[PDB]
Design a protein around this nucleic acid. Sequence first.
RNA 1: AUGGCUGUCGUCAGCUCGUGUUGUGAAAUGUUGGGUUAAGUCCCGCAACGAGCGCAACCCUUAUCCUUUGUUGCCAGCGGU
Length: 109
Amino acid sequence: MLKAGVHFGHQTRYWNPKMKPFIFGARNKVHIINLEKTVPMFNEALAELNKIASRKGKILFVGTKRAASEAVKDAALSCDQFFVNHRWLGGMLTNWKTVRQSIKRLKDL
RNA sequence: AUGGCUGUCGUCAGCUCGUGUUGUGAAAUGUUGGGUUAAGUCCCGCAACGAGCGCAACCCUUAUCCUUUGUUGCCAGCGGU
Ligand SMILES: [Mg+2]
Ligand SMILES: [Mg+2]
Ligand SMILES: [Mg+2]
Ligand SMILES: [Mg+2]
Ligand SMILES: [Mg+2]
Ligand SMILES: [Mg+2]
């Protein structure tokens, strides 16, 4: 059921109290996420993703420059998948009508 | 009361607008930060992405060379001198 068991992690500060229910603690000299309360979560996330996937929904994966970089690179690239690897321009989805002028620039260029 | 025209800050590099976002609001952001430049000139970063007026560049003159033309300008090679 579990996808590997390697979640050693490194974060040791700034635990958000709002997400207490999903945390175990003890190990890490700080904290750790509960592995039992995550098997029944992503197994749903995918269930919901499938619906939009049907009408070839635009997922638009996100990872900012060095956040993933070597972790994602371009594995997102597929038949009907898109991604943002470089800096996520501050406020581009909300003013997409303003980013059309720049996407046209990229196309013409 | 004005049109038109002109002086000065000042040939200093600044002054603004679209959408976006933040704030109850006047407003802020961008336009600030790290470098650099004669310059809001350019690069990186960034809650902003673009654009406009301005700076530079297009203009004239000057400093080198080449093509054409050779008088009313010029005289290197030759001659009457
Ligand atoms: Mg508001
Ligand atoms: Mg200013
Ligand atoms: Mg301002
Ligand atoms: Mg600066
Ligand atoms: Mg400029
Ligand atoms: Mg002679």
